[PDB]
Amino acid sequence: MHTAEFLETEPTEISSVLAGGYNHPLLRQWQSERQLTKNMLIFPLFISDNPDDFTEIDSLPNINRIGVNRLKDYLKPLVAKGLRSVILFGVPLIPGTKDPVGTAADDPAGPVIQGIKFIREYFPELYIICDVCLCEYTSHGHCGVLYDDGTINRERSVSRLAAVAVNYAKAGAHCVAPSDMIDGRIRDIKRGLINANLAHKTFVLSYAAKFSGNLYGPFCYQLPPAGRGLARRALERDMSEGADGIIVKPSTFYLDIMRDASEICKDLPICAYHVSGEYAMLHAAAEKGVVDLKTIAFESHQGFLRAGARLIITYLAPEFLDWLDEEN
Template sequence: MSFSSLVSDITYRDSDRDDRRSQVSRARSYASTAATSVSISGEVSSQLHGGYSHPLARAWQAERQLTKAMLIYPLFMSDRPDEETLIPSLPNQYRRGLNKLVPFLTPLVRKGLRSVILFGVPLADGSKDALGTSADDPQGPVIQSIRLLRRAFPSLFIIADVCLCEYTSHGHCGILRDDGSLNNTLSVDRISDVAMAYADAGAHCVAPSDMNDGRIRAIKLKLIEAGIAHQVVLMSYSAKFSGCLYGPFRDAAGSAPSFGDRRCYQLPPGGRGLARRAIQRDIQEGADVIMVKPASQYLDIISDAKEIGKDLPVAAYQVSGEFAMIHAAAKAGVFDLKTMAFEATEGILRAGASIVVSYFTPEFLDWLGN
């Protein structure tokens, strides 16, 4: 029994819906058991099809200069359908509701936008609790956005960030023990259930950013058992470092911890050895893409990731603090914005990344031309 099922009687979930989902899950498991029993008992890293099932994922397997295909644009999806609110600490970035999504993306897709990554921002009263139960709510902003985007933009590659920090009342990336420390076992079960809900909704890629130990293997196994591992890319935030560069993101997503910090699960600055071990672990557990975050401050880790995962695409997240600092430097007249953005991004690529998550994506679509 999964953790989500175990706690369903004390959450906001509808029991009938859980029963139906459980029946579908069991049916999928029975259908896939014969085909996947060897994989499950062996190495999950042998499952490769999901990593290149989509045309964009296949393009990511090649190394090249900066192109539109390697850019992923972060979107903050509000549970208020008509919201379009500027994020003051994140220049030119907005929280948007479902009704604003297609009009905003339509011109970007025409310019060549290939991929987005979705972050949910629940704002309704009672939408946050200790278990993050709204993270996989079928009526929540992420699942509704996935379904809408699949209909509106059939060629757009949709990534769902998988974490609980936006949905928990305490703001941490998992489920806590009574003493406030992270319960890794319950957190992994919960995170993997959320990843499955996003995959079921139609996400081409699930990207766990929580940094709990073992979540890549747990998600991969559930994808295998559901019979959809061949069509879902598993992108791991493998080397995610703690630090001060996430402030604007936390303003945007409302995900700042209500107490303490995330140093017990995010990597310590300078922890190069830990980063290498985390990258190796996630590859062994079945990750299709590995990510380093932040990007520009950790070019050595990107280089390590390319060395360790030389046969995998490496992604780098040019985080909110990096983006805001480049804007501030450009405003101060140090260099023009285009020059600074290109230099920062090309440095990331030279270090070994072939995928870049960037808030500069709309500008790059113009700067790179046809």
């Protein structure tokens, strides 16, 4: 009758027995290239122009469009939760501030700079990173100063971006993360900060790896999902140009690239960015119950830390600061 056949073995090789390095729950911490702390988490901020704002955005989000008079409450707790950083996103809502060169950009009286002067004073502890891009303050809305009903005017847009970059940096911001992807914009932003004699205080945190996928909003210069080589050349370039740290985004779908980042940009702190897409994708997935949020959140995030990142820009920040406090 059908009986269970058992082949005849050889003595076990000592080089086939790894399993004892990972058995206890503690040895699974002792195997992590790096353990996740609170001081890694960087929270994005979307500071709106109506200083009374606190407008919820969404696709799955629990993210908002706050105003400068709400800031001392939304930020208060989180900080007491141990929060050490934020990445400001300015939101002009007034009827006439856009334009042909995103002039309203470096605007001493806008969301961004009127946000950065608010923290440096009510929350001196925090560490301010400022996204640097002309997308949002321009009529066409493209990221950069454009030509005749076409294609971005590099040198202009750059000359214009480096301008903003420094004003933030003059205003009191610690870091500047250019999010354009317009060639050589870094060489210039670093040069500018130099003349502006701020080189030694501001942390250029480039977005060396900004790809294009359905993960930013459902459906200009921006690297192809399959182009694995540009991304290596695009890092190596920004490293050369002065970048002090770099950003990879999206993240979870590009851990390999984040991986390349670490090798290539070995001596530069690497940062992972959990784009909103990913974010609202996880919540959306947790609601139908395809997985339990909390579970998938750390796995996905240690994915950052294993894959290469010693920093992270995520919306699950409100959440982790709670969690990382826990033991059993």
